Structure 1
Amino acid sequence: TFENMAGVFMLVAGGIVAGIFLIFIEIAYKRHKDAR
């Protein structure tokens, strides 16, 4: 109804969008290490 749920929505959205970006490179490095 107001910002009460919007705050947690913004928090989780920022968390997931940061996590995917910071973990794509980690997944690529893991794949490269497994397939050197």
Structure 2
Amino acid sequence: TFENMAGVFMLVAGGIVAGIFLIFIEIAYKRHKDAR
């Protein structure tokens, strides 16, 4: 509703979207590092 609330609402979606990809790539990076 408020400007701060709207900013938080817009930011959390982008944050979780970025975090999903970060976790997906970090799992692969950790697996590759463990394999080596």
**TM-score interval, normalised by the smaller of the two chains:** 0.5 to 0.7
Q: CA RMSD in A?
A: 2.1
Mapped partners of 2:3, 2:27: distance in 1: 35
Q: How many equivalent pairs are there?
A: 36
5+ residue gaps, structure 2: none
Give 4+ residue runs of structure 1 displaced > 2 Å after superposition: 1-4, 28-36
If the length of structure 1 is used for normalisation, what is the TM-score?
0.54
Quote the sequence identity (%). 100
If the length of structure 2 is used for normalisation, what is the TM-score?
0.54
5+ residue gaps, structure 1: none
